[PDB]
């Protein structure tokens, strides 16, 4: 019933004059809302939200929502008066009830058409009695449709000034919000395409929700100190670019917080009231909140958090990088797409390096030139090593769906570039472990993961006269089939074993039955 | 020591260790007597003079050490579980008026806190649970107008947070007392088991949080939900829940439900869907 | 490291009739051994506590050493082995970088000034 006249109100504000007409037309809503209580506001906003209108109509219908909310002086002296009065704690607390009554009998609710009944010319009494109200109202019940709204106005463009408006009026409303920061790392993770532009709104938004709270919970629960301080102030045409201690500084303040400190970076709460089982989770959700608002893209903001440990930084002891690796792992896999996406422009700069083409002098093995381990005696190499761990890190905090996105790029980008036999090796010690986890989940992966191998063998051994290490080769492939693979892949292998040097063929006889 | 600090309580606990086993002593008492150690004669004098004592109440935490100390005892612990149960229910004190027309509540107000529920053990904590429940069926069986006393509300919202007790806690709750409660059709207790359900806990398990969705459809439906304040609720508490779920949860929750897809979203409302 | 801790004062007679004995006990290439002896004086070098120490291990690093070598030539085709011993040990970067600013200056421009001064 409601959404029918939800879609006839903006039809016909759509047709409505702008003026007066506006003005008494949001004044009589608003009395019926409340000096008559029809209809809860909460089901009658979520009703005209929930439309599907295309061109000028959702802007009326928005700009109906705006009026609704701020106009109405009404609205406002209570939402003012429940965060003046009530607090979100209330466990800790013993005298709430008397406090519920004194807010109930300032303003009183109606939820059975009690206004409606009394301004009935004839006398019009209700005799129902009602139900046990412990702990409701209005502004709780409108709460969730409020967060729902906020979502509406930013899937559109031009309504920026009414949703700045509408937070910088309405923001104590989220000091009793349950789960207030998943709610910004979602919306914030969600609209990335919609907000790469307008850096001023998203400011703003988190801005509004941090300092919504900024009161109840103690010093420094969930922005740090520098970015409270710096770019906390106004935009002047000149954003607070940061420094690579910025980010040594949150990645820091992570491992710290997973290792288990006795003070710890972040003060401790009660895990059974709050909504973060443990403080590793509210950690990570913070730090990802806090990088994500930044007006910097995200290509640069990933370089630099990949060159927190590529490039040779002081604060990084070593014998603990291991730790660092994991903070930076999961703080990455967590971002959306345009930040973690340029590890693939750092695998594909890495392998073009010179000592992999053309200076091999070291003539030993390269087995053990990419083993990371081996950075307890001073053996880190060059980045070959440390882009290695950082693969493997990222891959193994990462999704099925992450990890799905590797063979179009094994198959497209790298299978052109290899020529010499240590990029092949290369490859084979970044693919290699994840074959499991691959067979596991998605066999299609595992089908195109074991032809390219076999392409890129193919290519190399047509394109070098010879291969000193074809020993390993012949036991990775054999080991490949006779454990992940099975006996799926036959058909597209006898071309190319037909066509290897006699020698391969030699000892690769076993491949094709 | 002193009595206030929480940790004596600790300090108490040994010594109530002793009465517990002096209780498995109580049948068969011929074989395996055990005699008293000799320093704890002195803290065992205390909790007996106190016992005959008939003064206690909730300023020191000598109750929680009565109920700790005669928890496993069907006459010592009658006296300190009722003793906390008449004060966090006010059996029959006063008719204190809720908001809005005929609501009745008893005139206990104060609940017990943080530190003395956290003072007591996990048999006097099951035994309360227990208790509690038996009084509410009990009134919803009866058909009372009266509405529960506030305090003991809140003290049913504050002993649901322990995840120990899921053998007996929000399992059987779900699982015997909404039913219950639903057919001795008051839609009083239900009306404050759902708002209890909406704005009083944070930590519950997937599966829970779908079998009560899935309760609250089959409620919503029948049994004429045709009153404003039932709707209401009903329509809160079904947006409440539905824009909470985890991110990474919902894929393997929904797979368990594939083959009866009716009985996780409604049909009347389009808004849940 | 052994000789570089305890004993620096002793004479380089016994030093280099150690390490030629210990190539002739097992074969190494010259370019391996020029590069283990480097890459093991900058190892001892960085570990170094602040004090006295430091100062020692310096001096024994930046002036030792290099009779060794001269030592090495006398007894022994050897100039381009040290050419690639120092092309290997060139490669790695991170090591330098810590020694580098460890020392707050370029070490590497100031070893191969001192090498090229005994030719």
Redesign the interface.
Known sequence: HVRTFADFLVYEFSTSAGGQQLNKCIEILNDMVWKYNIVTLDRLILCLAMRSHEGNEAQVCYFIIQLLLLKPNDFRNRVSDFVKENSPEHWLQNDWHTKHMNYHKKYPEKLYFEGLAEQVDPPVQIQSPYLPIYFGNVCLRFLPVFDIVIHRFLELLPVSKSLETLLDHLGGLYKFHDRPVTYLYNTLHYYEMHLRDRAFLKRKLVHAIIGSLKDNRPQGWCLSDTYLKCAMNAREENPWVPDDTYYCRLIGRLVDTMAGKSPGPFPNCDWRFNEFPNPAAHALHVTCVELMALAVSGKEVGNALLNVVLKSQPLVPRENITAWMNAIGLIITALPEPYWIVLHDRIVSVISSPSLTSETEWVGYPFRLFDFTACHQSYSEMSCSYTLALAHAVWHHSSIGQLSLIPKFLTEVLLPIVKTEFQLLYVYHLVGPFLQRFQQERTRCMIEIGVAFYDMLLNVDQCSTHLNYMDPICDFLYHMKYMFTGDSVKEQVEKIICNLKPALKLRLRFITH | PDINKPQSTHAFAMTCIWIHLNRKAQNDNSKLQIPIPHSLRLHHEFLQQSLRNKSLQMNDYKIALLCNAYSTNSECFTLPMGALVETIYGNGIMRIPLPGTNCMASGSITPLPMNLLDSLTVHAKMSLIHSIATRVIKLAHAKSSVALAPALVETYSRLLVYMEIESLGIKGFISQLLPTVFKSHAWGILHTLLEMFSYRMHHIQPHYRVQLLSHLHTLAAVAQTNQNQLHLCVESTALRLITALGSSEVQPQFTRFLSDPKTVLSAESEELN | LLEGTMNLTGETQSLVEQLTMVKRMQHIPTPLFVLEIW?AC??GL?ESPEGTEELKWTAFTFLKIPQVLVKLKKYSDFTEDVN?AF??LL?????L??AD?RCNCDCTNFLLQECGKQG
Request: net charge positive; charged share 35%.
């Open positions: 890459k900058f190892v960085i690639c092309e290997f490669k790695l970067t991170p090591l970088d810590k600013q």
